[PDB]
Design an enzyme around this catalytic site. Structure first.
Site, mmCIF file in Angstrom:
data_model
loop_
_atom_site.group_PDB
_atom_site.id
_atom_site.type_symbol
_atom_site.label_atom_id
_atom_site.label_comp_id
_atom_site.label_asym_id
_atom_site.label_seq_id
_atom_site.Cartn_x
_atom_site.Cartn_y
_atom_site.Cartn_z
ATOM 1 N N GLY A 123 -64.191 -65.243 29.248
ATOM 2 C CA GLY A 123 -62.923 -65.899 29.405
ATOM 3 C C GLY A 123 -62.062 -65.253 30.448
ATOM 4 N N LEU B 172 -61.005 -65.690 33.445
ATOM 5 C CA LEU B 172 -60.110 -66.365 34.367
ATOM 6 C C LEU B 172 -58.896 -66.936 33.668
ATOM 7 C CD1 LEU B 172 -62.770 -68.133 36.610
ATOM 8 C CD2 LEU B 172 -61.753 -65.833 36.824
ATOM 9 N N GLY B 173 -58.725 -66.722 32.377
ATOM 10 C CA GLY B 173 -57.642 -67.342 31.629
ATOM 11 C C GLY B 173 -56.380 -66.495 31.645
ATOM 12 N N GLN B 174 -55.456 -66.859 30.764
ATOM 13 C CA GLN B 174 -54.134 -66.230 30.778
ATOM 14 C C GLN B 174 -54.213 -64.730 30.545
ATOM 15 O OE1 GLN B 174 -51.265 -67.396 27.761
ATOM 16 N NE2 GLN B 174 -49.584 -66.476 28.954
ATOM 17 N N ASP C 171 -66.856 -66.437 33.203
ATOM 18 C CA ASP C 171 -66.177 -67.652 32.791
ATOM 19 C C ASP C 171 -67.080 -68.828 33.176
ATOM 20 O OD1 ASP C 171 -63.953 -69.704 32.330
ATOM 21 O OD2 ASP C 171 -62.713 -67.886 32.204
ATOM 22 N N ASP D 245 -71.656 -70.404 30.232
ATOM 23 C CA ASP D 245 -71.110 -71.056 29.039
ATOM 24 C C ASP D 245 -71.410 -70.172 27.849
ATOM 25 O OD1 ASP D 245 -70.656 -72.779 26.707
ATOM 26 O OD2 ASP D 245 -70.509 -74.412 28.146
ATOM 27 N N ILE D 246 -70.351 -69.787 27.134
ATOM 28 C CA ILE D 246 -70.471 -68.900 25.999
ATOM 29 C C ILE D 246 -71.385 -69.439 24.910
ATOM 30 C CG2 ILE D 246 -68.512 -69.756 24.650
ATOM 31 C CD1 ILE D 246 -69.133 -66.063 25.453
ATOM 32 N N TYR E 116 -57.876 -75.088 15.251
ATOM 33 C CA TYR E 116 -58.028 -73.794 15.919
ATOM 34 C C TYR E 116 -57.815 -72.641 14.905
ATOM 35 C CZ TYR E 116 -56.181 -70.051 19.014
ATOM 36 O OH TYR E 116 -55.828 -68.916 19.721
ATOM 37 N N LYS F 21 -60.343 -69.509 13.896
ATOM 38 C CA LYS F 21 -60.007 -68.093 13.950
ATOM 39 C C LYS F 21 -60.195 -67.371 12.622
ATOM 40 C CE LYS F 21 -58.830 -67.443 18.314
ATOM 41 N NZ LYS F 21 -59.699 -66.612 19.166
HETATM 42 N N1 LIG Z 1 -50.855 -66.822 23.571
HETATM 43 C C1 LIG Z 1 -52.085 -66.581 23.902
HETATM 44 O O1 LIG Z 1 -52.461 -66.618 25.126
HETATM 45 C C2 LIG Z 1 -53.031 -66.243 22.808
HETATM 46 C C3 LIG Z 1 -52.428 -66.100 21.473
HETATM 47 C C4 LIG Z 1 -53.340 -65.798 20.425
HETATM 48 C C5 LIG Z 1 -54.679 -65.670 20.652
HETATM 49 N N2 LIG Z 1 -55.154 -65.767 21.906
HETATM 50 C C6 LIG Z 1 -56.605 -65.566 22.044
HETATM 51 O O2 LIG Z 1 -56.840 -64.798 23.194
HETATM 52 C C7 LIG Z 1 -58.067 -65.247 23.836
HETATM 53 C C8 LIG Z 1 -57.738 -65.631 25.284
HETATM 54 O O3 LIG Z 1 -56.728 -66.608 25.308
HETATM 55 P P1 LIG Z 1 -56.127 -67.126 26.657
HETATM 56 O O4 LIG Z 1 -54.725 -67.503 26.341
HETATM 57 O O5 LIG Z 1 -56.384 -66.190 27.787
HETATM 58 O O6 LIG Z 1 -56.933 -68.479 26.848
HETATM 59 P P2 LIG Z 1 -57.271 -69.295 28.163
HETATM 60 O O7 LIG Z 1 -57.587 -70.697 27.754
HETATM 61 O O8 LIG Z 1 -56.246 -69.056 29.184
HETATM 62 O O9 LIG Z 1 -58.585 -68.570 28.651
HETATM 63 C C9 LIG Z 1 -59.821 -68.810 27.972
HETATM 64 C C10 LIG Z 1 -60.904 -68.951 29.018
HETATM 65 O O10 LIG Z 1 -62.089 -69.317 28.286
HETATM 66 C C11 LIG Z 1 -62.875 -70.121 29.142
HETATM 67 N N3 LIG Z 1 -63.777 -70.957 28.342
HETATM 68 C C12 LIG Z 1 -63.484 -72.106 27.709
HETATM 69 N N4 LIG Z 1 -64.575 -72.730 27.180
HETATM 70 C C13 LIG Z 1 -65.613 -71.901 27.553
HETATM 71 C C14 LIG Z 1 -67.054 -71.923 27.369
HETATM 72 N N5 LIG Z 1 -67.631 -72.977 26.761
HETATM 73 N N6 LIG Z 1 -67.755 -70.900 27.883
HETATM 74 C C15 LIG Z 1 -67.204 -69.887 28.554
HETATM 75 N N7 LIG Z 1 -65.870 -69.820 28.823
HETATM 76 C C16 LIG Z 1 -65.110 -70.768 28.272
HETATM 77 C C17 LIG Z 1 -61.854 -70.950 29.928
HETATM 78 O O11 LIG Z 1 -62.423 -71.501 31.154
HETATM 79 C C18 LIG Z 1 -60.658 -69.994 30.117
HETATM 80 O O12 LIG Z 1 -60.655 -69.368 31.398
HETATM 81 C C19 LIG Z 1 -58.609 -66.368 22.951
HETATM 82 O O13 LIG Z 1 -59.492 -65.839 21.943
HETATM 83 C C20 LIG Z 1 -57.356 -66.867 22.289
HETATM 84 O O14 LIG Z 1 -57.684 -67.561 21.102
HETATM 85 C C21 LIG Z 1 -54.383 -66.095 22.982
HETATM 86 C C1 LIG Z 2 -51.064 -69.848 18.681
HETATM 87 C C2 LIG Z 2 -51.014 -69.060 19.948
HETATM 88 O O1 LIG Z 2 -50.700 -67.875 19.869
HETATM 89 C C3 LIG Z 2 -51.651 -69.632 21.212
HETATM 90 N N1 LIG Z 2 -50.934 -69.277 22.438
HETATM 91 C C4 LIG Z 2 -51.702 -71.125 21.201
HETATM 92 O O2 LIG Z 2 -50.549 -71.641 21.379
HETATM 93 O O3 LIG Z 2 -52.825 -71.716 20.925
#
Ligand SMILES: NC(=O)c1ccc[n+]([C@@H]2O[C@H](COP(=O)([O-])OP(=O)(O)OC[C@H]3O[C@@H](n4cnc5c(N)ncnc54)[C@H](O)[C@@H]3O)[C@@H](O)[C@H]2O)c1
Ligand SMILES: CC(=O)[C@H](N)C(=O)O
Length: 310
Positions: free
Chosen positions: A8, A10-12, A34, A49-50, A138, A142
């Protein structure tokens, strides 16, 4: 002293975590992964792909991966709209990560979310050990993930650690599939235009954290001695709790803007989550303390967004 993979990437979170890891450990120790290969990207990158266990395993064994930061997921809003995809990516992806860790004796970081909680438990200062009856697709993924991780720890001896992140706020990578995303979007649009249409009502109040705090928490937890930890996959973690209008007011102290509130389906998600979180166990076991309050986060957001809008 270990090769590290970030899924993951490239994500946030991954946008910031990969750089933090390169700096901490060296560029020769970090592999990013990613779905699609980015142009103009410094870290070594392997697409996967995961859900594709064969390719995932190959990346792990060809790069001698010893630690995985597993960020790949589908988030709460995108997941409520596509429940089958959400399950498949989040649960089967996690299972692939865990099975691989057991084969290769890896250490893991597998995050959870405040979305594990439902309205049957306290909304204020939710305790670490309450029942988990989430009302979102979701959130259910989790909870299943926490339990799978904790099985791998207890049964299989895998050192898997995780944090129930609150909503995360950053400027480097604007989120697009979640529910807490309004907080980021409000910053971006306040600075870019002085206006925003918020997709939750003005009183929506959720646990939130600035990205620098979330990244530091991740690294600090991963560095803790195992025997200090009383929890594994699912630490509660806290910083801030505020309502949408409270954020509007804070932003308005820096830039002229006006917010309009036009809720959508994501209200029904947010309504089911707590307002704030008791993270005593993190604070006790591994020394967690947040450093960014709403004021300090706002200064950082606005300064960087103003720069980006020059
Ligand atoms: N506020 C938040 O950002 C937040 C809050 C709570 C939990 N989280 C957890 O933190 C982790 C990262 O969150 P994030 O906000 O960076 O999410 P995001 O969506 O920004 O990044 C997730 C990445 O996963 C990749 N992805 C999606 N489907 C895929 C697949 N089939 N195979 C491989 N890659 C795949 C996407 O292309 C994306 O770049 C996750 O487990 C999320 O549940 C995030
Ligand atoms: C619940 C969270 O923390 C997450 N950013 C989402 O909004 O899915």
């Amino acid at each position: 002293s270990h090769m590290i993979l970030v899924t993951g990437a490239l994500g946030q979170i991954g946008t910031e975590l990969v750089l933090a890891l390169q700096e901490k450990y060296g560029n020769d120790k970090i592999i990013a992964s990613d779905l699609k290969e980015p142009e103009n990207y410094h870290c070594k990158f392997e697409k996967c792909d995961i859900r594709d266990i064969e390719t995932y395993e190959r990346i792990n064994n060809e790069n001698k991966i010893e630690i995985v930061y597993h960020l790949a997921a589908i988030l709460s809003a995108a997941g409520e709209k596509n429940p089958e995809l959400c399950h498949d990516v989040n649960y089967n992806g996690l299972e692939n990560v865990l099975k691989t860790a057991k084969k290769y004796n890896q250490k893991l970081f597998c995050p959870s979310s405040i979305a594990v909680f439902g309205p049957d438990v306290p909304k204020e200062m939710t305790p670490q050990n309450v029942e988990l009856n989430p009302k979102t697709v979701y959130g259910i993924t989790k909870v299943k993930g926490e339990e799978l991780c904790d099985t791998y720890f207890k049964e299989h001896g895998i050192d898997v650690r995780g944090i129930r992140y609150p909503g995360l706020i950053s400027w480097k990578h604007k989120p697009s599939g979640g529910t807490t995303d309004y907080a980021v979007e409000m910053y971006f649009d306040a600075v870019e235009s002085g206006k925003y249409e918020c997709f939750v009502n003005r009183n929506t109040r959720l646990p939130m954290m600035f990205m620098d705090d979330a990244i530091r928490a991740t690294l600090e937890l991963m560095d803790a001695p195992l025997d200090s930890l009383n929890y594994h996959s699912n630490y509660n973690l806290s910083s801030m709790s505020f309502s949408a209008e409270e954020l509007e007011k804070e932003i308005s102290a820096h830039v002229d803007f006006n917010c309009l509130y036009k809720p959508d389906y994501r209200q029904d998600i947010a309504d089911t989550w707590p307002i704030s979180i008791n993270d005593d166990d993190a604070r006790k076991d591994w020394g967690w303390e947040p450093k960014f309050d709403i004021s300090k986060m706002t200064e950082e957001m606005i300064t960087n967004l103003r720069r980006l809008n020059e």
